[PDB]
Design a protein around this ligand. Structure first.
Ligand SMILES: CC(C)C[C@H](NC(=O)C[C@H](O)[C@H](CC1CCCCC1)NC(=O)CC[C@H](O)[C@H](Cc1ccccc1)NC(=O)OC(C)(C)C)C(=O)O
Length: 330
């Protein structure tokens, strides 16, 4: 089997991308953020405390004939941005893009923190890192990818994220029309539970490529590209009005600049980020300062290839028993 689904940015800055998923029988359709940096499928539900629910769509397990309470199990997750949720667990049928798994754990939120209440576009998360990071206790639960691989025509999914535009998640096949040249695969370490890998170096604009190892994770669930302090200072030293601003938390630059490109290495291949991608947007509507898309990971402790970098490429998540990551230009 395969599945294919359109993914769309939640806003005009491509802050994050939602993809409809159908849970339950008959299907209730909720728009989830597919997050390669975490391993829980959780949703807003009829369980959720009501004054924490805003305009999201809720899962109502009492309405689905295939839902079953997983007795005893609870969950509690907090993410890199500070936000957090917890609750209890059902198993149900969940389909994405045509592809259906029965008995997927769907984690039902009792409580969500502020940032989730405040974002009306996102009805919960679907985690696609490795299932060792799943928060359900006492027995951790598989991600939708892990439950799907038995039936997939190949044990992969693709991410094809758009710049200010819709794109695609595919499961179980690689669409040869969606990229150009050939895919280069690199090894993944799953020792910390992420799709973690080491990039072979970087170039800024049209200067030299510097071979230096950057160990990072490919994370559809993080908006920006977070890289070590000195590589990030090397990029913005090429943008004449850029400075680091403690007030806004990052490098800003005049929205009128043309930014140089940024290249990252994958084995012997190179992925080029166009500079307009790194112009994240204006720090407020109307302002003449813009927010950069490459910022220092010193404060987070790990380098993150977020959607800035991933939407410049077609990305293969190869979930074979030794997993790899594939990059192609598109
Ligand atoms: C629990 C663990 C086992 C794994 C867990 N992993 C992570 O936290 C990384 C994971 O990818 C999480 C997953 C996201 C959590 C927040 C909701 C959206 C999903 N990423 C994150 O926690 C990273 C947060 C994102 O980078 C936000 C995304 C966003 C912004 C605005 C509006 C909507 C969405 N961007 C964002 O704040 O961009 C600005 C600052 C330029 C505005 C952890 O390490 O804590």
């Amino acid at each position: 089997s395969t599945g294919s689904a359109t993914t769309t940015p939640i806003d005009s800055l491509d802050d994050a991308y939602i993809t409809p998923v159908q849970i339950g029988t008959p299907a209730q359709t909720l728009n989830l953020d597919f997050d390669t940096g975490s391993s829980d499928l959780w949703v807003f539900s009829s369980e959720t405390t009501a004054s924490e629910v805003d305009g999201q769509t809720i899962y109502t397990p009492s309405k689905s004939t295939t839902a079953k309470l997983l007795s005893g199990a609870t969950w509690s997750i907090s993410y890199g941005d500070g936000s957090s949720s917890s609750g209890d667990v059902y198993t149900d049928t969940v389909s994405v893009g045509g592809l259906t798994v029965t008995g997927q754990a769907v984690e039902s939120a009792k409580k969500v923190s502020s940032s989730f209440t405040e974002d009306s576009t996102i009805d919960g998360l679907l985690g696609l890192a490795f299932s060792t990071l799943n928060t359900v206790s006492p027995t951790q639960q598989k991600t939708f990818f892990d439950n799907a691989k038995a039936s997939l025509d190949s044990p992969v999914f693709t991410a094809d994220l758009g710049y200010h535009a819709p794109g695609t998640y595919n499961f179980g096949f690689i669409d040869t029309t969606a990229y150009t040249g050939s895919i280069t695969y690199t090894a993944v370490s799953t020792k910390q539970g992420f799709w973690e890998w080491t990039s072979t170096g970087y170039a800024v604009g049209s200067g030299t490529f510097k071979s230096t190892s950057i160990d990072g994770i490919a994370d559809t669930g993080t908006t920006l590209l977070y890289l070590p302090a000195t590589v990030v200072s090397a990029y913005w030293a090429q943008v004449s009005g850029a400075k680091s601003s403690s007030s806004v938390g990052g490098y800003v630059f005049p929205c009128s600049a043309t930014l140089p490109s940024f290249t990252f290495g994958v084995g012997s291949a190179r992925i080029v980020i166009p500079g307009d991608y790194i112009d994240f947007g204006p720090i407020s509507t109307g302002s003449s300062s813009c927010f950069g898309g490459i910022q220092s990971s010193a404060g987070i402790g790990i380098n993150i290839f977020g959607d800035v970098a991933l939407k410049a490429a077609f990305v293969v998540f190869n979930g074979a028993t030794t997993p790899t990551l594939g990059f192609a230009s598109k």
